[PDB]
């Protein structure tokens, strides 16, 4: 047959369509699912392995940088609340929802994972019954319904399509008796990412916690405390509940304790450093490593002022150690193959490059034509105050600025280059040389905005950057500030 179009790259999974409600004849026909070899969890790692032919030189700051990587001193009350709710709901065989919200990097996922680890340790001591832990991250899903595919695959071991998985989970949570079940603890991380238009997924996940036979713990980690009030309906907000756990950004003393806990064994300690290569061994010269308490304190105070984000504090300390290690390796010439201190200067330089703006020094290093464009644009904003200027007006005002300051030395040397490219055989041009080039360059830089128009004269252009930093970059130039 002759097709009207073709779909030649269809990749379909081997997922069955029949839900769990048709797996046995009756409710009484359902066996004990705990004594089943595929329920409740009853190969790629070696492809990224090779043989090492050299000996990596780990310098003395490499252990500091390794210990400062992201891979519970400040979360006691949050840990205790989450653990007590989960322990009470597991040991009494009930279903509940715990809500956790906070800004990035305040220890939400780490605290919930530690709670789950301690509950698994308590279930290994036969103090609470066994449970299955499932982690669903909404930003790791391709489609939002794939969470239905994930959770059911973690429960039964089957692979169904998402609608059949949703019916299977509904039948499982509602109809299967508690004597044939295991408790499930589900972490719904990045809860805002699973919010869709119809909000059926959110309703189903929080409504399964209201069923009497469910034995389901849903720990929902969010980014805002008012997500059910802003984005969800009244039905899902009623099911989530009034009790919500806020993870506040860290104060500077807790960030100080976090950084000291990552460096408890390294700070104020001695290393055997081999001066031939640079390789350092933690307990040939005996060198003491030190990072200043003033440096850690000022980085922690800065980070707690900004966000209270532990990732940022660890990254600022790691960047300071990297800067100091770069200077040390440069001054000794070591390569990769008596007191070494990472100081408050390195911490301030790590804190400054994140706060430095390149926009002004980008604009001060442009050519004369791009600066002339920006200067004429600012002149037109001063003349009429419209904040959007047509490109033809910019052309006319560039021409005006050339013919008005014609007695200037630099302008009377630049005019032949601008309008004829220094050639007698080239006619006088309506645009300057490199007009399109500097227009497109300022558009790709994000300095400029241009409307989608086909007439080149009446097309409007807007500053995307702030006006005063453009004026500062214009007054930096010698020629433009004199005319």
């Amino acid at each position: 047959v002759i097709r009207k179009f073709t779909k030649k790259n269809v990749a379909r999974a081997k997922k069955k369509y029949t839900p769990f409600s048709k797996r046995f004849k009756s409710i009484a026909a359902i066996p004990d699912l705990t004594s089943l070899p595929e329920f409740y969890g009853n190969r790629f790692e070696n492809k990224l392995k090779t043989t090492q032919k050299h000996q990596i030189v780990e310098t003395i700051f490499s252990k500091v940088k390794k210990q400062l990587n992201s891979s519970l001193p400040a979360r006691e009350n949050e840990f205790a609340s989450i653990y007590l709710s989960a322990y009470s709901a597991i040991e009494s065989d009930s279903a509940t929802t715990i809500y956790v919200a906070g800004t990035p990097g305040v220890g939400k996922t780490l605290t919930v994972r530690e709670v789950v680890k301690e509950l698994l340790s308590s279930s290994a001591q036969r103090e609470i019954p066994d449970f299955l832990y499932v982690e669903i991250n909404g930003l790791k899903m391709v489609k939002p319904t794939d969470c239905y595919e994930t959770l059911w695959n973690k429960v039964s071991g089957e692979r169904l399509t998402w609608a059949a998985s949703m019916e299977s989970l509904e039948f499982y949570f509602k109809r299967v008796p508690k004597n044939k079940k295991k408790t499930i603890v589900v972490l719904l991380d990045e809860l805002d990412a699973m919010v869709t238009k119809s909000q059926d997924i959110m309703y189903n996940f929080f409504n399964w916690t209201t069923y009497e036979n469910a034995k389901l713990i849903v720990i929902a980690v969010a980014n805002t405390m008012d997500l059910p009030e802003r984005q969800l309906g009244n039905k899902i907000t009623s099911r989530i509940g009034f009790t919500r756990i806020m993870f506040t950004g860290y104060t500077h003393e807790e960030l100080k304790n976090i950084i000291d806990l990552r460096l408890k064994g390294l700070n104020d300690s001695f290393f055997y450093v081999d001066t031939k290569t640079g390789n350092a061994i933690l307990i040939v010269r005996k060198v003491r490593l030190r990072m200043s308490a003033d440096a850690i304190e000022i980085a922690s105070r800065k980070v707690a002022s900004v966000s209270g984000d532990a990732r940022r504090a660890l990254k600022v300390c790691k960047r300071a150690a990297e800067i100091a290690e770069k200077h040390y390796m440069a001054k000794h010439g070591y390569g990769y193959d008596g007191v070494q201190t990472v100081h408050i200067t390195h911490v301030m330089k790590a804190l400054n490059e994140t706060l430095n703006s390149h926009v002004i020094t980008f604009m001060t290093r442009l050519s004369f034509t791009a600066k002339l464009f920006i200067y004429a644009l600012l002149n037109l904003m001063k003349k009429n105050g419209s904040q959007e200027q047509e490109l033809g007006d910019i052309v006319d005002e560039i021409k005006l600025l050339i013919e008005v300051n014609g007695s200037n030395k630099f302008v009377m040397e630049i005019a032949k280059t601008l309008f004829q490219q220094g050639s007698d055989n080239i006619s006088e041009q309506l645009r300057i040389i490199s007009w399109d080039f500097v227009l497109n360059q300022l558009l790709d830089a994000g300095i400029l905005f241009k409307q989608t128009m086909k007439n080149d004269r009446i097309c409007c252009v807007k500053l995307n950057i702030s006006v005063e930093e453009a004026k500062r970059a214009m007054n930096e130039d010698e020629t433009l500030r004199n005319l």
């Binding site: 949703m166 119809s198 059926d200 409504n207 039905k235 009623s238 099911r239 509940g241 009790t243």
Partner: protein, 154 residues
Amino acid sequence: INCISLGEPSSIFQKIFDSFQDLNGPTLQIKNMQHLQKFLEPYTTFVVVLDEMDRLLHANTSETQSVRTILELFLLAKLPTVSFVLIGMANSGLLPQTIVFQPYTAEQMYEIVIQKMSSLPTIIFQPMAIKFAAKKCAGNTGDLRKLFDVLRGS
């Protein structure tokens, strides 16, 4: 039957059939009004309780096609030679009977709480605490779930 936990709102008739027919017999394929109407004709009362009946509306389309399935079910629970009694619960001459469930008051919430904890040997709350929790949780448009989380958090 919970309507949100179905794949599509058009399959609910089939779901009703998979809620009724014996598994040893022939499992038929059902689309709409007519096949269910033909199936219940030889029969015995069929009670269906449909939680969230409003999400049976199609959120897309228009006013003509969003009220297709609900009107079809209301017509199929109204005509003779069947025994189909339909209960639908949504959130806030053949039109259905309506009972509005009302938000609970403080005394109602109190009586619900002492009735629920009457199975317990002792009561580890002061009754004034339950009364204060009920009067703060009731207000206007109250939910008993909020009172349950307040007491559990206490």
